[PDB]
Write a protein that binds this ligand. Structure first.
Ligand SMILES: Nc1ncnc2c1ncn2[C@@H]1O[C@H](COP(=O)(O)OP(=O)(O)O)[C@@H](O)[C@H]1O
Ligand SMILES: [Mn+2]
Ligand SMILES: [Mn+2]
Length: 269
């Protein structure tokens, strides 16, 4: 079977309990994770150890907190105490775990299932070919020896409008924001980088990225995490918002793809 789980945010106990609930069996089953594996929850170290050990039985996309962790590890950004990253950063296998983490994709595609995954979703300004190329470019810099220069460059809220003519720093920043920070769009599809609330309480003319028709969503189901204020509701057919806020005292959600059956694990704190 195929299982898709939203943002774990260091909630290792809840992850393991949910996976035992569905009897997840590496070799017979595959697990999809929406990213933001780490931070806020107490168990980022255990989460990373486990997900890395799954190997080919897991398909991960990186989220904004995974990228932030990489930036802290490389000394680009400052550690926020609330993230609870110190046990992972000080772990004897920190190098192993994080060098593995920076090699993981921003985008997963399964053609037989017609299924696409990224942390924040797919901007309506991208077709599948363009999303693929952008994911490849950013993954290539993330997996290179020079990845801390990229991590430093990534921070920023501009430009927020895609164009194939974008070059250099602006292009990489947009790609990063579209995959890992996107929530609301302007009607022309341009990113808004500020509002993090639920769609009903957002100001006009902002609309959810998935409320705007785009070539990828027209042909593929899209699964994503990231947008916890959504609470996994209010999406159209073929759009699966899996982040139900486990680190926030909400719930960890698992979707079995074959029968679209949901399994839910309450937060422990
Ligand atoms: N149910 C909710 N309603 C409104 N805001 C929320 C809700 N849940 C989380 N948030 C807020 O959303 C902000 C962004 O957090 P989140 O959606 O989890 O994304 P990320 O993990 O990338 O930081 C947090 O500052 C939190 O306070
Ligand atoms: Mn996120
Ligand atoms: Mn998150």
């Amino acid at each position: 079977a195929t299982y898709l789980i939203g943002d774990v945010h260091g909630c290792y106990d809840e992850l393991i309990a949910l996976l035992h609930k569905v009897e997840f069996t590496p070799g017979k089953d595959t697990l999809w994770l929406t990213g933001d594996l780490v931070a806020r929850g107490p168990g980022s170290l255990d989460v990373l150890r486990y997900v890395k050990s799954l190997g080919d039985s897991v398909r991960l996309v990186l989220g904004n907190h995974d990228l932030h962790l990489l930036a802290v590890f490389a000394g680009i950004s400052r550690n926020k105490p609330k993230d609870r990253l110190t046990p992972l950063l000080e772990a004897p296998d920190a190098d192993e775990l994080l060098n593995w983490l920076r090699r993981q994709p921003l985008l997963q595609i399964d053609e037989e299932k017609k299924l696409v995954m990224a942390h924040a979703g797919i901007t309506p300004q991208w077709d599948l070919q363009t999303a693929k190329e952008c994911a490849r470019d950013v993954e290539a810099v993330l997996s290179s020896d020079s990845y801390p220069f990229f991590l430093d460059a990534m921070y920023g809220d501009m430009p927020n409008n895609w164009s194939p003519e974008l070059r250099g720093l602006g292009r990489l920043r947009f790609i990063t924001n579209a995959f890992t920070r996107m929530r609301f769009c302007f009607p022309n599809g341009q990113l808004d980088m500020y509002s993090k609330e639920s769609p009903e309480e957002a100001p006009a003319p902002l609309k959810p990225w998935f409320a705007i028709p785009g070539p990828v969503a027209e042909e593929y189901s899209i699964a994503f995490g990231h947008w916890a204020s959504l609470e996994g509701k209010g999406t159209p057919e073929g759009i699966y918002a899996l982040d139900t806020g486990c680190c926030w005292g909400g719930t960890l959600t698992c979707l079995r793809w074959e029968d679209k059956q949901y399994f839910v694990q309450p937060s422990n704190r």
